[PDB]
């Protein structure tokens, strides 16, 4: 069973947090993947993007560990990416899945043209960067699919995007930097100020402030 070790985890297991977007609203760090299991565990799907052997030269020889890149997310606007290096492939993949769970960010979706129906593309042109890898996401007409390389295509599909134009510059062969740049571009979708977000912020009580009295007696 799950025993939380953090205040936020105890609040989550107490059924006092109504949604994961409420945790995102205050940008609180998530350090227990069980929170993501609690909130989106019924819809999350993970995918091992890559396994690569990394070698450290030693006196005896070459010590080889394995680095696992795993992209997780539900196809409704939550995606995360996790990289874990470990001695064995199985535990590397387990840790990568856990890390991808911990890094799940909300994805903002928008409309290329008319605003009929549900959002389908990125709200605006966004860009992610990771060590010479440049990944640009451009809104695309409804029904055009994701025009991207297979790795950013996986990351974008897992994030709930179904129409997107993509551009990549740099050493995109390095799947790790390509995936991290795509994840950064996705994460920037909610950090881009748009004229519909000009409405003044109406602040709400923090999860900790609202429920401190709950643990004041406890």
């Amino acid at each position: 069973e799950w025993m939380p070790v953090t205040k936020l985890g105890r609040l989550v297991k107490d059924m006092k947090i109504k949604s994961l977007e409420e945790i995102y609203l205050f940008s609180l760090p998530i350090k227990e993947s069980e929170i993501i299991d609690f909130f989106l565990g019924a819809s999350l799907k993970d995918e091992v993007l890559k396994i690569m052997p990394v070698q450290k030269q030693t006196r005896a020889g070459q010590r080889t560990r394995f680095k696992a890149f795993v992209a997780i997310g539900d196809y409704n606007g939550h995606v995360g990416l996790g990289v874990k290096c470990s001695k064995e492939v199985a535990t590397a993949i387990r840790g990568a899945i856990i890390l991808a769970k911990l890094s799940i960010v909300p994805v903002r979706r928008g409309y290329w043209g008319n605003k009929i129906g549900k959002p389908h593309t990125v709200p605006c042109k966004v860009t992610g960067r990771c060590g010479s890898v440049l990944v640009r996401l451009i809104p695309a007409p409804r029904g055009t699919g994701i025009v991207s390389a297979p790795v950013p295509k996986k990351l974008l599909m897992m994030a709930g995007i179904d129409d997107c134009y993509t551009s990549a510059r740099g050493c995109t062969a390095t799947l790790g930097n390509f995936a991290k740049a795509t994840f950064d571009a996705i994460s920037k979708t909610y950090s881009y100020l748009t004229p519909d977000l000009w409405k003044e912020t109406v602040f709400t009580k923090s999860p900790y402030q609202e429920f401190t009295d709950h643990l004041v007696k406890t």
Partner: peptide, 27 residues
């Protein structure tokens, strides 16, 4: 998780069959 290909890769991470095992491990 499939362990057979993981062991085959861990025996020799850069052998003749390294590419196929790594590709099979991806998905």
């Amino acid at each position: 998780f499939p362990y057979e290909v993981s062991d085959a890769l861990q025996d020799d991470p850069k052998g003749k069959y390294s590419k196929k095992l790594l590709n099979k491990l991806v998905g």
